[PDB]
Ligand binder design. Structure first.
Ligand code: ATP
Ligand code: MG
Length: 738
């Protein structure tokens, strides 16, 4: 029994090592410390300082250097007694300050303990190295175990959700968010792995599992923050029958980063699939596809990075091709997907030349003709449609000769649509396979980024941020109720931001954006002007910059984020020349024809991108609203992708943005420590005369100690089953003499 075998890997990897004694006495000391900022400028970097004295109003402590300082008791960040170092739930700490929180988190990480709870949340720190806690043997141990019974772990939250599902007959949700590279997908895959094991019986399970890899090849890429970043968000519905067995699955994708297909920053890569293809394609497939090295392609030859360390695109291509096979994609299907990938590479190879007049021309039909063949479309129609699209100018339909820039840009537009569309198609194709109309229950997993606050924030960041204001409010509401429940079981702000963004009347940012969208001739300037006009000095969550003329700022949950308006008009419309669609609709390819002839794929509805985003977010929320949710906050330890490197600033910032610290401060004001009578006595019986560790009237005994100690009744609160302590209370208690 691993949970009991102190020699087990379980103990080794998941628990703080346990000695031979329980004795309260070991932990005895007389020293008292505070967490202080040695450099007031750098407030997230703190040092421990012993309190050498005290006044009625302050504290006087000694620094590392032996430098004495004074602090207000109220501004003091007192350090919890050493015994608290490493607890599995921050909700267990007595002093709940920010430094204290990071500390516990750090003590744990120092021991390779990546999972820690914070009340309702499961905090997970990226180890940046392998930890063998995900083996089948690991899985088997979590089965049926209460949260309190076992150590913190993703498998643990997953078990709770499945048991709740079965016991409450209620659907469930796991929300996993955090920065790029923080480890979301990793945890996501574990949740599924675990579910499949605990509820599976396999063929479906297989196909389910195999879906991921497909999604990864097409929607994942190498960025500066992660070698395998998911450039899209997702919602995974794991379906079950009334018996508790997996019946199916459904996938919902969002915000795919199409842009990446025609452009990548230095060092980054295009989607993994491009490379897998280039590498593991048979030599006899290459020729059929007019393939070469990535170096030979405009879309792959520009970041100065075509491969990933510790990664074989060919080996991976095998992997992908297998999954497709398992899922059920016909060879013919597979072909076409590759052809598309191919065509896309060819399209980017097209060189627009425009010297003849002021309209572009094609001196070389090579690339062009390559695209056409693989697409199974006409080169002449493609050609025209690209540089001479007929545009409706009133009553007349006239073909316009496009310049070079415009020409290239349309070609790019074509490529992005191909991709985005193919992506949708795959998702669709997969759901068909695993998805159930008639399902009894479900467990859903949402994996997407948390707030994004980059150097430069564009339309996509507004969107993601918007989603996050909603998730945060959901958490907040959910937290409110359950807190009340518990306080009830025992005898014991985002609206404004959301409105500014999605409001109808008065119109919010998105409504103004849609409005400007109707006008062919509107510009970024008209748009940014309209926005300031309506909110500058008028809406409290908005800010007009002192000097930039292309940006505006939104005060979010996370804090202020400054956005830039470039291309928002275009992005909202996501325009594609009709001649283009025309061209592609006749496609000899059975896969191509769908992308264009299927209204479910080829069109949004009439609605704009923003309108579609709002809608999907609402359906999402709605659904979530019907489940019992679970929250996992994935934390990146540093920005270097290194182990044993947990940077306070890096960390603190995420804890502030993600709601963990907020949940704490809040709880901090209440009665944060809620202990079970038996457990209380066991550890502190010694504090009072006449109390045996094992006492049948735990509540009475509890009262004994408190009474003996002469604690202030305002500080503690008798619950039907637990004793509730205000902040600092347990600490001093702990700090008492045997
Ligand atoms: N528990 C873990 N054990 C080992 N490695 C991990 C763990 N969590 C994350 N990592 C590793 O760190 C890398 C980044 O993690 P992951 O891909 O899951 O992050 P992410 O949150 O999904 O990022 P993004 O938003 O860019 O897609 C991974 O390739 C992963 O292998
Ligand atoms: Mg990811």
């Amino acid at each position: 029994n691993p949970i009991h075998d102190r020699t087990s890997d379980y103990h080794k990897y998941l628990k703080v090592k346990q000695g031979d004694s329980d004795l309260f006495k070991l932990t005895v000391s007389d020293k008292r410390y505070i967490w202080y900022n040695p450099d007031p400028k750098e407030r997230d970097s703190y040092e421990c300082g012993e309190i050498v004295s005290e006044t009625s109003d302050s504290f006087t402590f000694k620094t590392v250097d032996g430098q004495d300082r004074q602090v207000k008791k109220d501004d003091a960040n007192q350090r919890n007694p050493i015994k608290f170092d490493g607890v599995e739930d921050m909700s267990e700490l007595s002093y709940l300050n920010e430094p204290a929180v990071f500390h516990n988190l750090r003590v744990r990480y120092n021991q390779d303990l990546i999972y820690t709870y914070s009340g309702l949340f499961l905090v997970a720190v990226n180890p940046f190295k392998r930890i063998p806690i995900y083996t089948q043997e690991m899985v088997d141990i979590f089965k049926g175990r209460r949260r309190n019974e076992v150590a913190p772990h993703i498998f643990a939250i997953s078990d709770v959700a499945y048991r709740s599902m079965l016991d409450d007959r209620q659907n469930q949700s796991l929300l996993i968010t955090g920065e790029s590279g923080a480890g979301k997908t990793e945890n996501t895959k574990k949740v599924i792995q675990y579910l499949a094991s605990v509820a599976g019986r396999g063929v479906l399970e297989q196909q389910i599992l195999q879906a991921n890899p497909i999604l990864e090849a097409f929607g994942n890429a190498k960025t500066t923050r992660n070698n395998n970043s998911s450039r899209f968000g997702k919602f995974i519905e794991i379906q079950f029958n009334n018996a508790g067995f997996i019946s199916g699955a459904s996938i919902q994708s969002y915000l795919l980063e199409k842009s990446r297909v025609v452009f990548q920053s230095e060092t980054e890569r295009n989607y993994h699939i491009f490379y897998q293809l280039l590498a593991g394609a048979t030599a006899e497939e290459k020729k059929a596809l007019h393939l070469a090295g990535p170096e030979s392609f405009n879309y792959l030859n520009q970041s100065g990075c075509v491969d990933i360390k510790g990664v074989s695109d060919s080996e991976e291509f095998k992997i992908t091709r297998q999954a497709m096979d398992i899922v059920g994609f016909s060879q013919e299907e597979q072909m076409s997907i590759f052809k598309i990938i191919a065509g896309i590479l060819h399209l980017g190879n097209i060189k627009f030349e425009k010297g003849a007049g002021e309209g572009a021309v094609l001196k070389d039909k090579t690339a062009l003709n390559a695209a056409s063949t693989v697409f199974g479309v006409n080169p002449s129609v493609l050609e025209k449609a690209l540089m001479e699209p007929r545009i409706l100018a009133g009553r007349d339909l006239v073909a316009q000769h496009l310049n070079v820039e415009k020409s290239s840009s349309s070609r790019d537009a074509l490529v992005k649509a191909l991709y985005g569309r193919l992506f949708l198609w795959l998702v669709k194709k997969i759901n068909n396979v695993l998805c159930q109309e008639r399902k009894a229950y479900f467990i859903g997993v949402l994996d997407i980024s948390g707030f994004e606050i980059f150097k430069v924030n564009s339309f996509e960041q507004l969107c993601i941020n918007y989603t996050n204001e909603k998730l945060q409010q959901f958490f907040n509401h959910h937290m409110f109720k359950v807190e009340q429940e518990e306080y009830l079981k025992e005898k014991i702000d985002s609206q404004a931001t959301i409105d500014l963004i999605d409001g109808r009347q008065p119109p919010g940012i998105l409504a103004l954006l849609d409005e400007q969208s109707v006008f062919p001739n509107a510009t970024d300037n008209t748009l940014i002007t309209k926005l300031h006009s309506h909110f500058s000095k008028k809406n409290a969550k908005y800010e007009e910059p002192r000097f930039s003329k292309t940006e505006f700022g939104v005060t979010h949950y996370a804090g202020q984020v400054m956005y830039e308006i470039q291309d928002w008009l275009e992005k909202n419309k996501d325009p594609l020349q009709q001649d283009l669609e025309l061209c592609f609709k006749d496609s000899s390819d059975n896969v191509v024809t769908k992308l264009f002839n299927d209204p479910n794929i080829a069109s949004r509805a009439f609605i704009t991108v923003a309108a579609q985003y709002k809608e999907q977010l609402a359906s999402l929320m709605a659904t979530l609203e019907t489940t019992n949710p679970h929250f996992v906050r994935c934390i990146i330890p540093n920005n270097k992708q290194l182990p044993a490197k947990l940077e306070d600033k890096v960390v603190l910032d995420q804890l502030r943005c993600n709601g963990v610290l907020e949940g704490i401060r809040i709880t901090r004001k209440g009665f944060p420590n809620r202990i079970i009578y038996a457990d209380f006595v066991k550890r502190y019986y010694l504090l009072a005369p006449n109390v045996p560790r094992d006492a049948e009237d735990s509540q009475k005994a509890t009262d004994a100690v408190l009474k003996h100690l002469n604690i202030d009744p305002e500080q503690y609160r008798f619950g039907i089953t637990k004793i509730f302590f205000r902040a600092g209370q347990l600490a001093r208690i702990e700090e008492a003499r045997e």
